[PDB]
Amino acid sequence: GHMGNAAAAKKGSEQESVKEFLAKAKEEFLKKWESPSQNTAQLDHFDRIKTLGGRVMLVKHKETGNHYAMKILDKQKVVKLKQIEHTLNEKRILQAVNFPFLVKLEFSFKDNSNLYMVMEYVPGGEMFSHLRRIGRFSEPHARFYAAQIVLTFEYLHSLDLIYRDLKPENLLIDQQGYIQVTDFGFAKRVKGRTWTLCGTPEYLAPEIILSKGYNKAVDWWALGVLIYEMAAGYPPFFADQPIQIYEKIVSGKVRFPSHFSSDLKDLLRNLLQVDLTKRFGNLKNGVNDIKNHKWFATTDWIAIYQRKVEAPFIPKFKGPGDTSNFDDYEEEEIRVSINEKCGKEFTEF
C-alpha cells in the first residue's frame, strides 16, 4: 500500500483526533448559536479614524487604546436591499464561531439609525493587495494559505455552515502572516441543499449558476479557484462580463499555466470538478481527500492550526493604528437620526 504500518496508524489516529475536536467545537458552537450575545458596548466608547473597505472603518476604543474594525450598517438601506436576514445572520454566526483563522467579533450594538459590529483589526490588509502586488505566489506560499482555508472549511462545514464568498478580497493577513477570513454576509447554516444565487462570479461553482440546488461542496470548488488564482495570479475563469464567466464555469474547461506543478494540476482538476460525484471534499473520504493529496504532503496540519509554522510573508507593521496596508476610500460622516428606524425588524441584533 502507499503507507507502512507506522504511517497508516499515525494517519488514522490523526483523523480520529479531528473528529474529536470537531465534536467539541460543535457543542460549543450550538450553545452560542442558541443563546447569542447582545449589546456589549456603545458608540461613544470609540474614536472614528478611517474607512478600510456595508462599510468598515478603523476605530479606537477610548479607554483601552485598542483599535478595531467597525462594520456599520444603515438599517434603512439594509431593508431597501432586502438584507435584514443577512445582517442578523452574519452577526449571529460571528458571535457563535471560534477558530484561529476567523476574524473575531469583539463587540456589537445598535442605535436609532445603524447596526455596529466591532471586530478585530487586522492591519496587514487584504491578500488581494499582496497578490496583485507580487503577481503570483510560489506554490509553497500558496499552500500555506490554502491549508488554513482547508482547516477553516473543515471547521465551518462540521457546523453545517456554508461560507459562499471565498476570494482574496475577503482574506486578511495578520501580523504573524496568517489568514483571517472576513465577511460572513453570505454564509448560511444549511444541513442539506440551498438555492440562492450569491457569491462572486469568478468563484461560483457550476451548480450555483444552474437552477439545481447545491451544498457545502461549492466551497471546495471555490478553494480550487482561490488556489489557482494564488498560484497563477489570475483566476481560472474570467471574461468581460459575469454572463460570459458563467458560461466558462459551466463548461468547466480549465487550462493551467505551464509553471504549475503536476501535483497542483491534479489537485485543481479534482476541486474544479463539475461532476459532484467526483469532486474532492464531496466524496466518501470527505476532507481527507484534500488533506492527503500529494500537493499537501509537506503540510503539517496541526502545526498550521497551532500557528507554529513560519509564515512566508510578514506585513510591515508601522504602528498601532497604522493604515498603510489598506487602500484609501471616500469618507462619510456616519449620521445618527433622532428617531429610531426599523426597530421591530432588528430586535435580535
Binding site: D165, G185, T200, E202, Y234, F238, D240
Partner: peptide, 20 residues
C-alpha cells in the same frame, strides 16, 4: 496570452459579490 486576456478583461480590481 492568458495574463494579457486577464488584463484586458477589466476584472483585475476588487470584485463585488452578487445576490439574486
Amino acid at each position: 496570452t492568458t495574463y494579457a486576456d486577464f488584463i484586458a478583461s477589466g476584472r483585475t480590481g476588487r470584485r463585488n459579490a452578487i445576490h439574486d
